[PDB]
Predict the 3D structure of the following.
Amino acid sequence: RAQHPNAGTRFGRVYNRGFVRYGFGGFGMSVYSSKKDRTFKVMPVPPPPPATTAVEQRDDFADNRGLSATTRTLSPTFRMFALEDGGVLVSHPSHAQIMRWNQRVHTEEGKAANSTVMDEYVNSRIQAIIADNTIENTSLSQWRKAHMWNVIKSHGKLQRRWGTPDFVMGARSTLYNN
Amino acid sequence: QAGSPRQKAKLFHVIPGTPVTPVEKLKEQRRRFGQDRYSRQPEYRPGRNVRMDPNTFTLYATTKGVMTIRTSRINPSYKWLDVEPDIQKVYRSRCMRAALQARGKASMMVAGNVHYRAELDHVTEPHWRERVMRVPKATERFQDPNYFTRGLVPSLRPLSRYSYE
RNA sequence: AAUCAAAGUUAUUAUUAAAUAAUAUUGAUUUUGGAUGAAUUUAAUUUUUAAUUAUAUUUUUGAAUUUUAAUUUUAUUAUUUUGAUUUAAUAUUUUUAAAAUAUUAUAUAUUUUAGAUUUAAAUUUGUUGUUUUAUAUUUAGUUUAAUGUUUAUAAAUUGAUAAUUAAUUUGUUUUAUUUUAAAGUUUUUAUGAACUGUGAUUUAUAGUUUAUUAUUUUUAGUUUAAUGUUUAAAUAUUUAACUAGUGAUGGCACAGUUGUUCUAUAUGUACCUAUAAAAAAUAGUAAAAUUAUUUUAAUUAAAUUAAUAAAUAAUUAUUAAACUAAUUUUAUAUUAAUAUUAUGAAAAAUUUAAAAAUUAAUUUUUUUUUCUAAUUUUUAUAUAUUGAAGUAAUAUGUAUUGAAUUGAAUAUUAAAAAUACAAAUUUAAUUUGUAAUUAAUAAAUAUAUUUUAUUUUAA
RNA sequence: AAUUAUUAUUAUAAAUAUUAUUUUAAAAAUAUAAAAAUAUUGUUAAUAAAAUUAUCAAGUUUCAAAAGCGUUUAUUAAAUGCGUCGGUCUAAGUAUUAUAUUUAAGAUUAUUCUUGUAUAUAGAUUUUUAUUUUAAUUUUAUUAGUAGCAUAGUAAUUUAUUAACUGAUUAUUAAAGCGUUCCAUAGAAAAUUUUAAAAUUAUAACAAUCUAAAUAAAUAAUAAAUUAAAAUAAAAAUUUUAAAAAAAAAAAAUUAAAAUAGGGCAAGUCCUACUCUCCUUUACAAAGAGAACGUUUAUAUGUAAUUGUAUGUUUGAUUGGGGCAAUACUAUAUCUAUUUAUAUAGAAAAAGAACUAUAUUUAUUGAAAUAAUAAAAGGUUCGAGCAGGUUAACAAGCAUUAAUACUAAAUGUGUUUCAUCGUCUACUUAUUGCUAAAUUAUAAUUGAUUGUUCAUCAAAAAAGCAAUUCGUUAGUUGGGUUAAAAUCGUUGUAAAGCAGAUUUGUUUAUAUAUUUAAUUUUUGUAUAUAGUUAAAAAUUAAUAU
Ligand SMILES: [Mg+2]
């Protein structure tokens, strides 16, 4: 055995993920192929609205048009003004003026034949938003259901572990991982 | 069937074109003893101020000066090693030739140009092929020995018959 | 059903160890002989219980080495009368012995689920995590001096005599060390003949076939087989075979370069490589190890040689260096001095070789502070419209040749003609009969673009 | 004997003691076998020496090969042993004797010829063959001969068997048996014939003893696991990983179900052997002592001598310094030649010079398996190679790695292969493996397979034959020669004591035929003659909430 530094990988050899792919050459290893990429790929674009402008609404890579052609619904309410700095001051109807509007559209949605037992349910949740802002989203629910427990462990010092001096709080705070 | 030894490296021990001391082996040639028989013809025959060692066919310069290879005009396979003794004579021109051609004021038809030598000779001596191709009759190659005693020909050289140009 | 992460204190008792110290010493653990001695004998000109201040010589060329230090002068073999002093070490036993958090159709501990996975060390001679070690807890577990302050001074040379205009340091004399564990061995003497050899040792406790005192044989301990396989056994249970010993399990006798051997290199106390004892043999030349996180300058090399790798280049390393034209106002790891148990380079580009890889080749050859930002995406285009099948007697001619025969369609021969139809099917030959050099445009991309794994910041 | 264990410690003596340690409600294996129809070797490498029995426990016969009856650590043409014979010995033992050997008794015979040891020898070596030792290469006559006989082989013939790799016979040039040969030959190991109880194939067939639980509490092994399955690709390897994609008790398929054997290589040591290396060496010879004997020398060097060498590289040849082959060179492919052999002692004494070594050049012979070994890794049986089968497709001497031999038994499996549609043969010889060939008619081909079972083969000084060796020994052939642990994980078969009920979908050890008859249509077709079916035969049924 010729044990010389610079004769191979300096101390032994390790297979970190930046190696098992992108090996010497970028192909890169013969074994340890790699993990399949199980991320969340973004979804493809919706179709644009029909043209009926004759302004060449069809052209994609033109200077005038921003790519997105989203003339959706109460967008005319989002009437924007030109500031001084070059910014924009978009005046939109508040989150209540919309849910209160949505109730109107929805309450006259199912009433034609018979508002279903779920249709009565939605207008309640809608009429529950204007009044109380009864929130329905995970990002707060995932936060609130936890943040409460985390802060109550503080007010009532239910630690059981008072030492935890950032060496023992070293593993923790990184054995968790967000 | 047998074994074999490794072929040694017989290559230049200076940089051609650059100055040279005498204790430097200019080139360590293959005394091409085909296989240790006694007849060889070295690649780089000796030139001006260069003297060949008899045993190992290595050219050692005889006076310190810039060195160069003169490829024979007839056959570009047979080269000499010229050492021209004056190092300032070429340095103080190179520093010009390379300062002129920087300002774009030097001509590329120079004799020292590598790719021009084929045409350079032909601008001056237009029939030099015929001056070396000409076969001499055995009469003129041994000019009348009486012309040597009568003193007409300064000295008869009967063996120097080959035009090495 | 399934998980669930989990208890650091016994309690109680007091004069050894190790080195050291330069005063004693006829063999430590009952009362010899107990007839009267013959029986209680360890001594000799050799590195020895005697332990020696140099680097020059000289030397099988290579493990060989320096002579009184003061003549009896103190370097000399050592304890009770400070728990004898000192410094290092520190216990050992008795009986102690403990505990309440994460699912509900399953990848692996974080409470908010999902994301997440070499267990390490070696070994990788990149045959690139190459089939090796580790159950766990604690204890024990490996020796190259990182330093030069006043008395004080060094420094070369011939082969040899000698010569030394030859140019010059440093040093109150610096030495000592050199890994760790591990063989088979190997030599030096002590123990063993209760096992077992062989020497020697017993002169008639059952059955039986045959004329026979010889001879077939009852034959429960032994040439086989099953079981057993850390077994009840480091050889036993059951069983086959054998069994006739006036010539032999046996008084004591031979002992290790050797005894014994009806000889198998067998055994001589449960592996004969005898035991026992005393060494530091060798083991770097692919054995196992070699103990201290948070760092602060990089790299490979591939040649001379080898009764085939401790040695050399080259590399790497430790320490140290000086700014020679070439350019930008760019950009540059070049060296010295020492330390060095190494022979073979992925994917290519090619080149030897039945290679069926080896060989040459020559560029690779990964150590993530934390929050964040980002331009390389297990999503690309695949060959058909048309079984053109009606439309007409002939005529050099069934050419010639070869042929049993051949008439365009046996065989060979193929540029003859004229009023167009000789590379076939068909028939033993012909005629009939199929056939009559035609519409059938895939080309016109389809999405191009956008949008995704590494080009930054802030702390 | 590690114990309160297998265990009458057999020196003796005796013969009627109602002397006193053994859990328990089951079927699997297994140790084991009472009982019981046929069959008799078709099982197997091979049946037959294979426990006891009141049903009283015994196979007979022929041929070939084979001695003594003792004796042995892998148990026998091992080694003993009597006789004969060769040699030695008349101042320690009886010369028809005892030493020292080679053979083997009994019966026939015991051939041809010599190059060396030994003897004799004459200063010694060198020479030198009455007998002896060893030899005979075409000794090879007698004699047996395919035989434990180097291949060639299953020898060619004959038998024998349905089938003859058996075995026996004839002869007979046997790779190189051979006079210590050959015959004769008994219990042995074969080959027949034949009979036969072991549960030999067929064939499966629990009577017996060997619970759970309660109690006591050991062992191998142990990096971890929540992954482990399963399928597929891989890349260095057997696959294991990686990845993708899925989704209690028995058995031994995997993990190391194994131990430990089997290799071959490296450095180290061991042990044995002989013409070539070398001491301590006790013998031979010389000399010296008026030789009274013991010592010391000199010259000699003995395998009796126990030291060390016996290589290295590519595989068996090569070792040098050059050159051509892209100013690459494994030895690649070719060739050349005063291309030179450094040092040290000797040799040359002025400046000049000789000798020799794997020609970088350190050591003082060459060989062995010794059951070789110890510390290591690494292969014979392979994700790739090589040489000898009809020429060519195929057995298979080098790149991995406790996978730890071929075959058989049992037991599976995924493939693939024409028209339904397809794959169950059993035997003989040899256990080599695969064919030959007998049963009317005769087994598809690949692949992964065997720690469960044997051991037949292959196999480790126990021998022996021919064969190579100066020997130690080496390689064919035959007889011998332990083959093994409490099952933890996976895995799978079952089970969880439950149930008034099979079943929606998962998923399937489970599937009608491949030892051929008789019908019936034998007419259609043409020289013989088909085709659905049926009966019989191969005799058995299968449901987790
Ligand atoms: Mg410790």
Summary: The radius of gyration of chain B is 21 Å. Strands of chain B lie at 19-20, 25-28, 44-46, 50-52, 58-61, 65-71, 79-84.
